[PDB]
UniProtKB/Swiss-Prot annotation, chains A, B:
Database matches in CDD domains: SerRS_core
Binding-site positions, ATP: 283-285, 299, 370-373
Protein family according to the UniProt entry: Belongs to the class-II aminoacyl-tRNA synthetase family. Type-1 seryl-tRNA synthetase subfamily.
Protein name: Serine--tRNA ligase
Function in brief: Catalyzes the attachment of serine to tRNA(Ser). Is also able to aminoacylate tRNA(Sec) with serine, to form the misacylated tRNA L-seryl-tRNA(Sec), which will be further converted into selenocysteinyl-tRNA(Sec).
UniProt subunit comment: Homodimer. The tRNA molecule binds across the dimer.
SUPFAM superfamilies: Class II aaRS and biotin synthetases, tRNA-binding arm
Gene field: serS
Keywords for this protein: Aminoacyl-tRNA synthetase, ATP-binding, Cytoplasm, Ligase, Nucleotide-binding, Protein biosynthesis
Localization terms from the record: Cytoplasm
Enzyme Commission no: 6.1.1.11
Amino acid sequence: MLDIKLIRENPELVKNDLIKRGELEKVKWVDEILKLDTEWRTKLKEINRLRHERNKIAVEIGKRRKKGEPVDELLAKSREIVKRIGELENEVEELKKKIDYYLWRLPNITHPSVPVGKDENDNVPIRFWGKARVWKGHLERFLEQSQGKMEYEILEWKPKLHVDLLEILGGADFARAAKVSGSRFYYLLNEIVILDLALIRFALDRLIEKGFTPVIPPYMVRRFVEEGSTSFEDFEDVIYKVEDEDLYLIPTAEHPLAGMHANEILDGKDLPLLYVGVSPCFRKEAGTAGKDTKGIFRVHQFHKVEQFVYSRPEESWEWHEKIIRNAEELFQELEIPYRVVNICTGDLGYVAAKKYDIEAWMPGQGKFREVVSASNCTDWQARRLNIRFRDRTDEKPRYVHTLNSTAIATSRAIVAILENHQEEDGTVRIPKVLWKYTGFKEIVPVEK
Amino acid sequence: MLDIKLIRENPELVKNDLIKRGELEKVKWVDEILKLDTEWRTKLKEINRLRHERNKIAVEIGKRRKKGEPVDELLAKSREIVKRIGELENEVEELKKKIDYYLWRLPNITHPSVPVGKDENDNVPIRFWGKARVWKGHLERFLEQSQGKMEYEILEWKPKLHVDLLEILGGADFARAAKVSGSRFYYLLNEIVILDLALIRFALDRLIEKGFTPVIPPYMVRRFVEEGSTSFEDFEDVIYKVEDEDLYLIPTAEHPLAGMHANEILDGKDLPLLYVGVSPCFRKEAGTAGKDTKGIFRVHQFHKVEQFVYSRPEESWEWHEKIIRNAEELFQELEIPYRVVNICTGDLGYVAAKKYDIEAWMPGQGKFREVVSASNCTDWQARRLNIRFRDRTDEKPRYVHTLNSTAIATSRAIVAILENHQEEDGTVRIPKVLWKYTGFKEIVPVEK
């Protein structure tokens, strides 16, 4: 939700951002909000005018109580004021709603460090890491995406895609999943199941060590926490609702982690609050027609360990940088070459004020694909969920700043590992880091 | 689903089984089915009769095409024959419907060793294990449920309930979950989260050691896999359905584990198929008014590692005994005293022919509670999901038997570990076998 004060104090700043985001259809709202914000405040002025009047008309009837007291009239102007007052109050109540309706539907204001853009072809690579194994036939595309800024090694043989690797490794059954649940669902098997749990614990351990309290939240939540975590557009695009219940399947532990302190007032001394959640994630993937069919990259369900941070507005950005790094450290340990990216305004999304994505090099696809996403939501969620805080019990509670970020979303990490650590015969070597969790050190294909 | 050949050949057998089950109402069905099945078979006869007659009446009009062809009378019959065939064909369709309607609702035929009873009170203990810690105040109930066939020691102090323990340990927040999702939901924290994942892994490890194929299945399935795994009653009572989609939230890794081979003909050579799934579980818990409020025992979501077995009809019973014991083995290493009970007709359920439950002694609650259940479904599920097998490509395919059993349902396992390994100060000692997974050996109280 946007801050009424902001629209009042700089409509041009907002209007321009709405345009950087490509949401022209809404710039016309800025004016309509003030239009209403204005009627709202004059009607207030009137009510007070009115309240003061009744006081005056009150003492006046008293003065006449001693006189001829022809107060039949005054007692009528009174009944009028009270008639008016309520009507106004109601009229005002109506304006606040129309105003709020629009405020809840406006994207967070972007930070000036956000590059201006149209789509994802305008995001901006700002850091690289690792030695990318590149197939001869990808050389140019790789170099365009790496900006020559990434170290690599050429491969004569062609790397296989994760979907194939899974099959030769006996790691999954797609056919049957489709029979049982439809498309974009899967049955994970053997080593791959351990690997999955393996990545969860790993992610868990690290964030805990860095002082995050581990939490397993409810997988189903009440509509308001979804309305307070993303835009109302997600209700059609991604969230599943269960029949006859005010219950929605969470698409990320982020949401329940945020609704955790809805309607509270935190004690500034506890801040920052550091949570690392684990939960299955459910997403409709309605907008995707056929961009990633069969496989476990763009699916309806998956596991993800998530970082959630409650901070004071002055430490948020410093934190935003901290979490994305926490995320980076994990993949480095997984020996997964990648590139962090600063997402532009057009592809930024309603909630984030600034977003950092870690796209991993995929030796098979010959391109970088999102693997983690770190966002600073400033006060957008707070303002919605009414999450405020105070330093001294004396006065005014201020809204806190919330930040979220993937640690490891298992499905997409497994792809990364599979494509990045494969060998000519299909064998996949597990990063040494994960040995204590997996047991095995590699996954050989069936037929040996 | 019951085999209609069973109802034809041995009506009395099923009526009598129904009676033991105390489903006096459904006993009526056996006669109804037989009746309708007869009308069905007969009308099926007459149809072929006519189909054949039509042919004969067809050639006959052709023979008269050369003769005086007084086929006006012989022609009016061909029109009634077909009119009749069509009437029957439709009558038959409507009968199969009425018939399958019952065949899909009859409970599975119970095995003779199933003790006759009415409710959970007529269930029979058959083994005990462990030394229980009993509060002096719970002495009577404890001897009642143990029949004094179990070792033990009296406690002068009163063991706390898990809900309390969870709070003094800082491992869960229920207030906030109720805010975010409602009652019977929760947030797990700190050492409790790791313990939850450690139980999953520990059960998965020991089951893989024993030859089970580990699998993560789809958490949402189509209606057919649900109607195939349970009785239709569970749709209102236990299963959540997702709005506008033919998808249902799974209450156990068992269902997708059974759907997995729906409409197949397995190669006998491969029997038995041993799967051990892991997954979140969702249950409406609609029938429970206020039997276990606040806590994590009766809840809407929990994690559970399940054993599923596709078996040859003649080895299913050997397997029903193998899995219940597999589970025992786990709780024993887990140092949890318990008793295993054999469920009676009344509290049996619709899909099982026999069923053992392991009830863990709960020191604080003062009673034995269910932590795992194991059933042999024989051919009830297989007949519904159309899961068959053959040894020789020559021969008719036979229905396989299916079975399932809990390995560990984290939620309940955690209350047992809590209430059973609690010391007087409230700290909880993690059993030794779980050390390689948790790192920590105990959970000491938060200071507040």
